[PDB]
Amino acid sequence: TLAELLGRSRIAQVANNHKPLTYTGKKFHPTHQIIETKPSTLYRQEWGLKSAIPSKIKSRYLVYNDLDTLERITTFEPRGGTQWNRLRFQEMGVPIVSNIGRQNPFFKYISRPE
Amino acid sequence: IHVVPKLPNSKALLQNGVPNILSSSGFKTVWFDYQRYLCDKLTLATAGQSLESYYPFHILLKTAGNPLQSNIFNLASSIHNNHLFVENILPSAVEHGTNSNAVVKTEPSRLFLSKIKDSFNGSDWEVVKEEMIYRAENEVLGQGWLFLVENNEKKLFILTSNNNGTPYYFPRNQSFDLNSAISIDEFATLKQMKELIGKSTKLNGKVQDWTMPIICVNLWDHAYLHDYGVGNRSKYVKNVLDNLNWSVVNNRIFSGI
Amino acid sequence: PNNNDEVMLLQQKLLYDEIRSELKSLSQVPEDEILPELKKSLEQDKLSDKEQQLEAELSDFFRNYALLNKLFDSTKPYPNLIPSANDKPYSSQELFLRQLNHSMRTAKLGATISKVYYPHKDIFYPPLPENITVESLMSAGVHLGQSTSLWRSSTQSYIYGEYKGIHIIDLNQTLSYLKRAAKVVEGVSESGGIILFLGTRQGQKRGLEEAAKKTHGYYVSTRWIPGTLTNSTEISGIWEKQEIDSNDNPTERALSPNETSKQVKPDLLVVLNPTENRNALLEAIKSRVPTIAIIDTDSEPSLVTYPIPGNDDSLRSVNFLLGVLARAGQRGLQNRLARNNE
Amino acid sequence: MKIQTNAVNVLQRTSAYLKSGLLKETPAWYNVVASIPPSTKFTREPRFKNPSNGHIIGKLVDVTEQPHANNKGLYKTRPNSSDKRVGVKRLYRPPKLTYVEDRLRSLFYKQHPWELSRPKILVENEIGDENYDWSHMLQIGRPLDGESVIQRTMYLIKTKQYGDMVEAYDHARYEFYALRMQEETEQQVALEEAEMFGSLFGVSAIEHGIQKEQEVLDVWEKKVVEETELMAARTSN
Ligand SMILES: [Mg+2]
Description:
Chain A is α+β, with helices and mostly antiparallel strands.
């Protein structure tokens, strides 16, 4: 059915987020999912959102909150810069270690009631 | 999704391999298995990204300058190189499946043999083949690729790559093995290359290289071991260079008409 | 095998450059250096029977193809390329042509690409209306309506539900409405009617121009002049009309001034963005011109004869629906040109 | 806006022009529209089911269907005020589509904030071509991301291998960690191996950031100096 397809659509895959797109507090990790469009689609203002992104946007990365609003605009910011922070961390090749010597969370360890 | 290209006369290739070079089992390893292995890994690496809509040759150029995309570059370079090798060693590029053609006598063209003499100080094609076999045995300790390339100055020269090294982009030719020791002359070449890459003003730190391959020989174990065995890779390279498809190799040389 | 043939020409080409270069060298030398010495030689020379042969053979050869000739009358690719010397490196132009050769043959070796969306193919390879699925419509984003805050409740029956603060258009109805609209375009095209494609949102021109081209129709991408249909004589009378046969070939018959001032009304109007083209829709109603339009959740369905429920804000969705309608028109045109042949 | 009449009746208004003789020649569209009638009802249509979750719309539970006591310990013997209000509006309001997967998606990205930094392409290729076997997480054609985990979790609960959604989710999460660790190593090793064979790179990611920060820090230097000189003059007053 159409409902089944919609639930699995790429737009459905992005978790609902209404966090401020302009946040001036302390940032410790990414808050919005970066959206990327290919160069061919960018030439046609196609991002896979509800409406065409304004042609003024030359970046290929954005973050958004609402597909449409009462102001008849998309709420988005044309930035994708948290990906470069992650890739620069990867280039520094420093593994993240636990200062408390806890078990690795990414391994299925056999824990006990200690 | 990147899919393995269909090859001309594929039924013959799956039955009698490539005559005088590979058997049926040897060709299944190099192309039907390894090419599937590469394309699947490339699809897993690039699916969901902008690179999925680009052909492997364009992917390697786009990613050649990105250190953390080397895995994608290696897969794209290997995929492009393997079909360059399988294309010039193929009995016939045209599909004589319904024409049952068994007479394909391809010989070096006049333009190729004229550029060989010009670029190799009058050496004949046979002598150049011996230099190519020698270069492969002494410069490629393990996996790699042997190329006959043409540069912007119309000169044919021999390039060898380690593992998946592209002939198109000199910063990624991977012609020097730094695991072993290098001479001061090799270090000078590397130092000069680094200076050229630093003169580029582009924010992507990319340079212009117009080198193009003419002949490609796969020096990976996936191509020779099963039929020749460890240590007999020079007998494999000799057979490949003696049974090249010159309809393809001649077409790779720019004529200008 | 035949390279020598080209070599024979190049030889002459090189010789021609040599002759021209030293023709210009003698154009600088003063006449006092050459002329008197040259004339003196002739004064000290005696013509022979053979020398005289060319004395008059060249006079006529120069009095026939230089003086008594008509100065005027009442390698195919890149024919202006200046090839470089075989010793010199490739020129910038030759490198471009050398790269183009590589692009055709080698650049696409290694893999083929399947199941990847290319935006241009929506315009140049639109599907037929019978092969369209809900999946295809959904892939194009046609189901994404407006914000629930902007709902025009007259569209209620087209809505499948609300999701992520927007109304989801029911693609099952979109498909049925699209098929009906496509058949209308095909009918009008097969009947020889004038089909006008109107869309004034940025980026729609390319789709609009190709749609008109493949249906032998017309398009407007810039601005709908208010009165184009109701005040046609004051706006469009000056522009040229033409007579055409059943094969859409110009008959070439000159048109009487009476025939060139008559209103030429479209037989069918397709509107990509009806919410911004109220003027055109009202003129179509006044002029009894049937209309097709994409109706988004905030758009009034009753203003058009054949609504197509769908997202009107995305160029992909619009160009997908326009492409289907354009191909439907093309099939009607091809069926009309075929019945004329047989 | 009023339901318009004149857009859908062009055929009937035209037919009056032709019958009277006001219009001599039949238009080319006339026959086509006659064979394909426009839809002219423009009605609001009721709906009795939410297509997403199959919830029934328009059903009233009668007191006879609630024989047992409630959470408060009281029996229901009469309709309550809500039961006595007409609910016709619910039949016509577009149903809110909901999905269990949406709850897991929000959880996954709350647990793994940096997965958001991995760019996602929302442009679809062809939804109808997706032939996925969710017995395994990796699939040819799609990236490895949070959605791979969600779809794997649903397959586990659908095959009844796990009963609780949490257990299926945790099982899928570990499969995701294993695949992510193999990719982080393939990239590190590929870079290391290339440098060992003489690969050269112009600008690294760290270098790219330094250059961009310099461009900004240079403009900032000028403005700071300018605004630290206007203050000195303005304050002198
Ligand atoms: Mg809209």
